[PDB]
Design an enzyme around this catalytic site. Structure first.
Site, PDB file in Angstrom:
ATOM      1  N   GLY B  48      59.899  43.317 -16.257  1.00  0.00           N
ATOM      2  CA  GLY B  48      60.364  41.997 -15.878  1.00  0.00           C
ATOM      3  C   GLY B  48      60.397  41.864 -14.375  1.00  0.00           C
ATOM      4  O   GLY B  48      60.435  42.864 -13.662  1.00  0.00           O
ATOM      5  N   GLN B  53      63.152  38.232  -6.821  1.00  0.00           N
ATOM      6  CA  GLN B  53      63.023  39.666  -6.599  1.00  0.00           C
ATOM      7  C   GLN B  53      61.949  40.010  -5.564  1.00  0.00           C
ATOM      8  O   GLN B  53      61.703  41.180  -5.278  1.00  0.00           O
ATOM      9  CB  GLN B  53      62.772  40.403  -7.924  1.00  0.00           C
ATOM     10  CG  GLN B  53      64.047  40.580  -8.746  1.00  0.00           C
ATOM     11  CD  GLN B  53      63.872  41.482  -9.966  1.00  0.00           C
ATOM     12  OE1 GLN B  53      63.169  41.134 -10.915  1.00  0.00           O
ATOM     13  NE2 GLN B  53      64.519  42.648  -9.942  1.00  0.00           N
ATOM     14  N   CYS B 110      67.428  47.457 -12.981  1.00  0.00           N
ATOM     15  CA  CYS B 110      66.779  46.373 -12.293  1.00  0.00           C
ATOM     16  C   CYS B 110      66.090  47.010 -11.123  1.00  0.00           C
ATOM     17  O   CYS B 110      66.623  47.938 -10.517  1.00  0.00           O
ATOM     18  CB  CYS B 110      67.800  45.365 -11.807  1.00  0.00           C
ATOM     19  SG  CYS B 110      67.086  44.155 -10.694  1.00  0.00           S
ATOM     20  N   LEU B 111      64.909  46.533 -10.787  1.00  0.00           N
ATOM     21  CA  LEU B 111      64.208  47.144  -9.690  1.00  0.00           C
ATOM     22  C   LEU B 111      64.875  46.871  -8.363  1.00  0.00           C
ATOM     23  O   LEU B 111      64.505  47.460  -7.353  1.00  0.00           O
ATOM     24  CB  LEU B 111      62.755  46.694  -9.688  1.00  0.00           C
ATOM     25  CG  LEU B 111      62.078  47.284 -10.920  1.00  0.00           C
ATOM     26  CD1 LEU B 111      62.709  46.765 -12.167  1.00  0.00           C
ATOM     27  CD2 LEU B 111      60.640  46.943 -10.915  1.00  0.00           C
ATOM     28  N   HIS B 152      67.956  39.029 -18.869  1.00  0.00           N
ATOM     29  CA  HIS B 152      68.017  39.728 -17.605  1.00  0.00           C
ATOM     30  C   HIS B 152      67.284  38.915 -16.561  1.00  0.00           C
ATOM     31  O   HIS B 152      67.873  38.452 -15.590  1.00  0.00           O
ATOM     32  CB  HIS B 152      67.380  41.112 -17.718  1.00  0.00           C
ATOM     33  CG  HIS B 152      67.183  41.784 -16.396  1.00  0.00           C
ATOM     34  ND1 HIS B 152      67.730  43.002 -16.088  1.00  0.00           N
ATOM     35  CD2 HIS B 152      66.525  41.375 -15.289  1.00  0.00           C
ATOM     36  CE1 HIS B 152      67.428  43.316 -14.838  1.00  0.00           C
ATOM     37  NE2 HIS B 152      66.701  42.346 -14.334  1.00  0.00           N
ATOM     38  N   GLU B 153      65.986  38.739 -16.777  1.00  0.00           N
ATOM     39  CA  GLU B 153      65.153  38.010 -15.843  1.00  0.00           C
ATOM     40  C   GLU B 153      65.593  36.595 -15.513  1.00  0.00           C
ATOM     41  O   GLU B 153      65.412  36.144 -14.391  1.00  0.00           O
ATOM     42  CB  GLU B 153      63.711  38.011 -16.326  1.00  0.00           C
ATOM     43  CG  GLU B 153      63.093  39.382 -16.217  1.00  0.00           C
ATOM     44  CD  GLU B 153      63.286  39.993 -14.849  1.00  0.00           C
ATOM     45  OE1 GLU B 153      63.365  39.230 -13.851  1.00  0.00           O
ATOM     46  OE2 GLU B 153      63.347  41.223 -14.703  1.00  0.00           O
ATOM     47  N   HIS B 156      68.593  36.545 -12.959  1.00  0.00           N
ATOM     48  CA  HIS B 156      68.124  36.706 -11.597  1.00  0.00           C
ATOM     49  C   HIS B 156      67.954  35.347 -10.970  1.00  0.00           C
ATOM     50  O   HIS B 156      68.249  35.158  -9.798  1.00  0.00           O
ATOM     51  CB  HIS B 156      66.775  37.421 -11.565  1.00  0.00           C
ATOM     52  CG  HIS B 156      66.876  38.910 -11.618  1.00  0.00           C
ATOM     53  ND1 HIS B 156      67.418  39.657 -10.602  1.00  0.00           N
ATOM     54  CD2 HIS B 156      66.499  39.791 -12.566  1.00  0.00           C
ATOM     55  CE1 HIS B 156      67.374  40.936 -10.921  1.00  0.00           C
ATOM     56  NE2 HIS B 156      66.820  41.040 -12.110  1.00  0.00           N
TER      57      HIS B 156
HETATM   58 ZN    ZN Z   1      66.210  42.870 -12.566  1.00  0.00          ZN
END
Ligand code: ZN
Ligand code: ZN
Lengths: 191, 191
Positions: B48, B53, B110-111, B152-153, B156
Site C-alpha cells: 500500500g 507518503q 507502515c513504510l 490503512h491506506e 493516511h
Molecule cells: Zn502506511
C-alpha cells in the site's frame, strides 16, 4: 558482562513488575541490578531506566540529569521544559502521585523505542514515595523535567510505554523531531 | 530519479489530503504521481502507499497483493488473516465505509514507520467508492487483508497513522514481532 536494553514487543516491558522486598533491597543480588541499571542508563546516554528495561521484572528505577546532559541544548528549550540537573537517584517500589493537576506537553523517547519521539502530556509537579538504594525509605518531591522522568520511568514498571499515551499524530522520527506540529495538535508548553 | 517515503513528523503525513479534481485525474501531472506511487510501493516491497507518503497532499492510493508477496508467509497465517492476492489497484478520492461491524486484530506496519509493528483493529468487510486510474468511477468491495490495506491506506489520507489506533502495549520492534502478547491484550484474529 552487561545486559542489553529490551525493545517493545518483549512482554517484560508490557507487564506489571513485582515489588522488590524491602530488606532484599540491600541484597547484593539486587544491588548488582541497581548498579547495572545505573551503568546502562549512562552507557547509551539516557536520563531514566526502569528495571524491566533490562529484563528485570522488579519495581526499580534510576534517574539523573547532569548539567552536562543539559549542557548541550537550546537555552529557550531547557527553559520551557523547566529542566534542571539532579544528582543520580535510585528508587525501589516507588509510588508516584501528582501534587497538582498542572500539566505540560513535550516530546519523549524511550531506549526501548529508539528512532522515535512523540509529544506526551505529563503532570508538572509530582511526589514519589518508596525506598532508596540502601533500603532506606524516602519521599521525593519533584516538578518539571524531573517529574516527567519519574512518570515515564514509573510507567515502565506497570507495562505502560509512552506510545500508548502520546497525542495523536505527533509521533515521529528522531530526525523529524523539529518539524512543525500538524494542525489540530495541542501546542507544546505548560500552563 | 525518484521521491522518497516520508516518515512520521512530516506534516504531510498528519494532515488531510485534498481531493484530486476528477478530470485532472487523466492529467499527465497526476498520472505521473500515480506512477511514482506504484513504483515506490513496489520498490521498498510494500502493498500500500498513499500520495502523502511521498509528499503529495492528494487523495490518491495504490495497492496490490501479489501471490509472490503472499508467497513467503505462514500458510496458517495467510489463512487466518484471509489474505489473497489482488491485481494492482489505484483509487483517487476514495470513500471507504465498513459493510459490517465485524472486525479483526492483526499487526500492521507502515513504510513511514519502519522497524515497528503494532496490533490494530480493522473492519473485516468494507466498500470503497471513488475513481480509478483513468478518472473512471468505481466501487470496490473487499474483505480480509485487502480490507485492512484499504483502511490503512485511506487513513493516511486523513492524517491518521496506525500508531494512534494500535491496541495498547502491542507496539513492537519488527524483530520482536513474533513475541507473545502481554497479558491483558486481546488475542489476534477475527471474531
Ligand atoms: Zn502506511
Ligand atoms: Zn523508557
Amino acid at each position: 558482562d552487561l545486559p542489553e536494553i529490551v525493545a517493545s514487543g518483549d512482554p517484560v516491558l508490557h507487564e506489571k513488575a513485582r515489588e522488590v522486598d524491602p530488606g532484599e533491597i540491600g541484597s547484593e543480588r539486587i544491588q548488582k541490578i541497581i548498579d547495572d541499571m545505573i551503568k546502562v542508563m549512562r552507557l547509551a546516554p539516557g536520563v531514566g531506566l526502569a528495571a524491566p528495561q533490562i529484563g528485570v521484572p522488579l519495581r526499580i528505577i534510576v534517574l539523573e540529569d547532569t548539567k552536562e546532559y543539559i549542557s548541550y541544548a537550546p537555552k529557550e528549550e531547557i527553559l520551557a521544559q523547566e529542566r534542571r540537573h539532579f544528582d543520580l537517584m535510585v528508587m525501589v517500589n516507588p509510588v508516584l502521585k501528582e501534587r497538582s493537576n498542572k500539566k505540560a506537553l513535550f516530546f519523549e523517547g524511550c531506549l526501548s523505542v529508539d528512532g522515535f519521539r512523540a509529544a506526551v502530556e505529563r503532570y508538572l509537579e509530582v511526589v514519589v514515595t518508596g525506598y532508596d538504594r540502601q533500603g532506606k525509605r524516602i519521599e521525593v518531591n519533584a516538578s518539571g523535567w524531573q517529574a516527567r522522568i519519574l512518570q515515564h520511568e514509573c510507567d515502565h514498571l506497570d507495562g505502560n510505554l509512552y506510545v500508548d499515551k502520546m497525542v495523536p499524530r505527533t509521533f515521529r522520527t528522531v530526525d523529524n523531531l523539529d518539524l512543525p506540529l500538524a494542525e489540530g495538535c495541542p501546542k507544546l508548553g505548560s500552563h
